[PDB]
Amino acid sequence: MTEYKLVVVGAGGVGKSALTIQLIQNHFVDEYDPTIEDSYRKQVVIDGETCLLDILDTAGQEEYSAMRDQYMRTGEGFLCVFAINNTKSFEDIHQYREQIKRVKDSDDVPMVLVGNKCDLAARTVESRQAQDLARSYGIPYIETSAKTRQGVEDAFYTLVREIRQH
Template identity: 75%
Template structure:
């Protein structure tokens, strides 16, 4: 059975834990308890393949940012989450992506962008079009999700697994490994 190491990243309070717990335990947690780091495992079937998701739910708070390099090194795919009700959390996505690429020393890494809390339409600060535009500029998939109403929760994680599979397939199809940067040596 294939195991996929997924990492959920994003600013504080965007709903990373709520999305993860909704996927794993099928319920919505509405009290806010900032995460330092939690790990979850779930066996699922994605496109007729049984696989094990190993999901690392990370801290959004800046005071835990020193831990990021470590989990970014071990993760295979990244769910980058912002809240549609928070413009600043949306603006943080670019920095998360840049850090992932730097730590992985790659031009491309399996990433899925999620605009969470889409059930809070009246408090929206980031349009769906802006989310789509950002994802398009990074050439990664995008979905709006709601951990509360379970909208696109499974789909977001499953789509990320498909991205990992696609990039692995591209790697094994010959040629240069997709994403790995060439080293420059000056003698």
């Protein structure tokens, strides 16, 4: 059957792990557990199509760059995650976007922009400027919350379509 190699990227502590596990395991993980590189498989059905997600979850820390290159090369689609209460994570999004472009030799790579932690009141990054940045890239933007599961199944499924339309 059809496999999709999705890759989840973003700064440390933004909620890539939390996103992936709420998808894989159907619950919220609230505990300290920084990632190195965890990998999950899960066969699902999106729009009638039976398919298999090979999801890679990565480490966001600048120390783990260069180790970035290998998983990018094999990846098919990229969730680029930041936190709406952490603006600095938002500005980091650019660097992942440019690196992903470099390693694969292209400018229109299957990408989705995910803004995580929207359940929070203390939000410093507005929905609009995230939507603006998304359009200027040519890729969708989805607001999710791993705590509540809003937009989660959306955000991953959207990436799949975005791979199919490429």
